[PDB]
Design an enzyme around this catalytic site. Structure first.
Site, PDB file in Angstrom:
ATOM      1  CD  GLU A  35      18.889  24.704  44.844  1.00 45.75           C
ATOM      2  OE1 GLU A  35      19.315  26.401  44.772  1.00 45.75           O
ATOM      3  OE2 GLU A  35      19.900  23.729  44.946  1.00 45.75           O
ATOM      4  CG  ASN A  46      25.309  29.877  39.437  1.00 45.92           C
ATOM      5  OD1 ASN A  46      23.854  29.639  38.665  1.00 45.92           O
ATOM      6  ND2 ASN A  46      25.028  29.552  40.671  1.00 45.92           N
ATOM      7  CG  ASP A  48      28.346  28.576  35.597  1.00 41.82           C
ATOM      8  OD1 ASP A  48      27.870  29.109  35.464  1.00 41.82           O
ATOM      9  OD2 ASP A  48      28.031  27.440  35.473  1.00 41.82           O
ATOM     10  CB  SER A  50      25.070  29.828  34.329  1.00 46.89           C
ATOM     11  OG  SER A  50      25.176  28.872  35.826  1.00 46.89           O
ATOM     12  CG  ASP A  52      21.019  29.128  39.694  1.00 48.27           C
ATOM     13  OD1 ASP A  52      21.667  27.671  38.571  1.00 48.27           O
ATOM     14  OD2 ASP A  52      21.442  28.532  40.683  1.00 48.27           O
ATOM     15  CG  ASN A  59      22.664  26.519  35.899  1.00 51.53           C
ATOM     16  OD1 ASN A  59      22.994  26.216  34.889  1.00 51.53           O
ATOM     17  ND2 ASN A  59      23.222  27.576  36.693  1.00 51.53           N
ATOM     18  CG  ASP A 101      21.210  14.723  32.815  1.00 47.65           C
ATOM     19  OD1 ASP A 101      20.791  14.336  31.738  1.00 47.65           O
ATOM     20  OD2 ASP A 101      22.124  15.012  32.842  1.00 47.65           O
TER      21      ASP A 101
END
Ligand SMILES: [Cl-]
Ligand code: NA
Length: 129
Positions: A35, A46, A48, A50, A52, A59, A101
């Site tokens: 990562e 990203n 979208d 967003s 990280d 995120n 989650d």
């Protein structure tokens, strides 16, 4: 801060990530390697919109507030910049929420594509833990 491999393993173990939700320590070290390359300051945008953040590339759509992500839920109740610190406490406490989650470590794309199903114990080889 760019962590050494065993340095990061010891810190993650201190914070209780070894076998957290059943994921052995090597899984967490492998995730961080792919990562962020062990760099607490890593940031990546990203598609979208967003971003990280940090050692575990957490995120901003769901987990932290960066002020520029529409619809951010900020479920870890932190500013995303706190994830860039040389102290990994905030990243670890947020990662514990993420991995709990429902999808486990599949939440981390690099873990799914590069660590899952591999000999992750190699990532802690040589470390005094
Ligand atoms: Cl799981
Ligand atoms: Na958010």
């Amino acid at each position: 801060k760019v962590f050494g491999r065993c340095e990061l393993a010891a810190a993650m173990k201190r914070h209780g990530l070894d076998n957290y939700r059943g994921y052995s320590l090597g899984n967490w070290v492998c995730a961080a390697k792919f990562e962020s390359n062990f760099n607490t300051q890593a940031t990546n945008r990203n598609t979208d919109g967003s971003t990280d953040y940090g050692i575990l590339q957490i995120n901003s759509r769901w987990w932290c507030n960066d002020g520029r992500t529409p619809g951010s839920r900020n479920l870890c109740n932190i500013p995303c910049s706190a994830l860039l610190s040389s102290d990994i406490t905030a990243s670890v406490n947020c990662a514990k929420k993420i991995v709990s989650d429902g999808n486990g470590m599949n939440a981390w794309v690099a873990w799914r594509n590069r660590c899952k199903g591999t000999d992750v114990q190699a990532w802690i080889r040589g470390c005094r833990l």
